[PDB]
Each structure stands twice: as structure tokens, then as C-alpha cells.
Amino acid sequence: GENSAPVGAAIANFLEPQALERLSRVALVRRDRAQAVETYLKKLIATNNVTHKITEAEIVSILNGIAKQQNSQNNSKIIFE
Secondary structure: OOOOOOOOHHHHOOEOHHHHHHHHHHHHHOHHHHHHHHHHHHHHHHHOOOOOOEOHHHHHHHHHHHHHHOOOOOOOOOOOO
16 A cells, blocks of 8 residues: 555556466466566666657567567677677
8 A cells, every 4th residue: 555665566556457467377388588677667667758659559568579589699789899
């Protein structure tokens, strides 16, 4: 209750009921994917990105990217030298 936000409560309220259930199902098979979804939300809110939440449409799209992200790659901002 209240606006305490221990650690995961702050991000738990930034999700959808239907989307939350989906994340639980995927985590059962691939926890790595579900871990990135929960960590991604906290990353955006903790950083500054707080203009939208994660719905069933967003969670499915991000989940697909999460699995694809782990495909032997580590270049994002270090490609200018």
C-alpha cells in the first residue's frame, strides 16, 4: 500500500494485469526473457523513460527482441571508433 515502493512495487504498478500473466507463463519456460522484461521496465523508469507502460502488445514485442538481443553482439554506442 501507499507510495512506499520497496524495490519491485514501483515497477509492478507500471504493468498491465493481462500482460503480467503472460510474463509469468514465458518466465516458466525461459526466465531469461521474462527477467529482461521486468528489468527493462525498471531501467526506463529508473533512467527517465516514463511516458508509457508495458501492455500485452509491448511485452510481446519486447520479449521477441530480448531473445534476439542475445545473438553474439555488443555494439551500440562503441561503433564510432
